[PDB]
């Protein structure tokens, strides 16, 4: 069981597009997630990978695979801090009762994507990390189960 952050490109130059992708594997019972992706605003700017629209405070992660089934009522939210380089995205079903009794666990899959148009040639860091939004976290990740209790003991993998 782990949450991973994958970048499809590691070392490139200015004006290029880096798709960061938040992913979960074997997160059994997961009914909801909150992640924090910390970046440097001076070196990198947050954008939508499909159209190229910049990220504001209310902007969600692109193209969720997990926690998106309308049967179980997804409640998506984002309170990002672009000024201080934080993506704060939360997603969380309401109808847990049905989700657990269906006999399907949303364990492995994509949480969401975020584009990153590069501004400077100097090298920087991109990772899942604690903020003011996520106290009592595992490397800037909170995860609940279909009973509402916080899941603990999964690993959080960063990119290179």
Numbering used by the authors: 4 to 163
Authors' text:
In addition, cellulosomes are central elements for the production of readily available sugars in the gastrointestinal tract of a variety of mammals. It is now well established that a wide array of highly ordered protein-protein interactions involving dockerin and cohesin modules (defined herein as Doc and Coh, respectively) mediate both cellulosome assembly and cellulosome cell-surface attachment. Primary scaffoldins, in addition to containing multiple type-I Cohs, have a divergent type-II Doc that binds to type-II Cohs located in cell-surface anchoring scaffoldins, providing a mechanism to tether the cellulosome to the bacterial cell envelope. In addition to ScaA, inspection of C. thermocellum genome revealed the presence of an ORF (Cthe_1806) encoding a protein comprising 2177 amino acids and containing a putative type-II Doc, which was termed CipB. Type-II Docs of primary scaffoldins ScaA and CipB in C. thermocellum possess two distinct Coh-binding surfaces that recognize different Coh partners.
This comparison indicates that the side chain of Phe136 in the ScaC2 Coh would clash with the side chain of Asn122 in ScaA Doc, strongly suggesting that the ScaA Doc is unable to bind Coh ScaC2 in this orientation. However, considering the inherent symmetry allowed by the interaction of two Doc helices to the Coh platform, it is possible that, if rotated by 180°, the ScaA Doc would be better positioned to bind ScaC2 Coh, a hypothesis that was further explored below. Thus, in order to probe the mechanism by which CipB XDoc binds to ScaF and ScaA XDoc recognises ScaC2, the crystal structures of ScaF XDoc in complex with ScaC2 Coh (CtCohScaC2-XDocScaA) and CipB XDoc bound to ScaF (CtCohScaF-XDocCipB) were solved. In contrast, ScaC2 Coh recognized ScaA XDoc, predominantly through helix 1 and CipB XDoc through helix 3. When the two complexes comprising ScaC2 Coh were overlaid (CtCohScaC2-XDocScaA and CtCohScaC2-XDocCipB), it was evident that the XDoc modules were in reverse orientations highlighted by the X-modules, which were positioned in opposite directions. Both ScaC2 Coh and the type-II Docs display a high degree of similarity when these protein modules were independently compared, which is reflected by the low r.m.s.d values (0.5 Å for 160 Cα atoms of the Coh alone and 1.1 Å for 54 Cα atoms of the Doc module). Although the nature of the hydrophobic interactions is almost indistinguishable, the ScaA Doc, which binds ScaC2 predominantly through helix 1, makes an extra hydrogen bond to Phe136 through Ser108. Steric constraints do not accommodate Asn158/Asn122 in binding ScaC2 and thus these residues are replaced by Gly125/Gly155 when binding to this Coh.
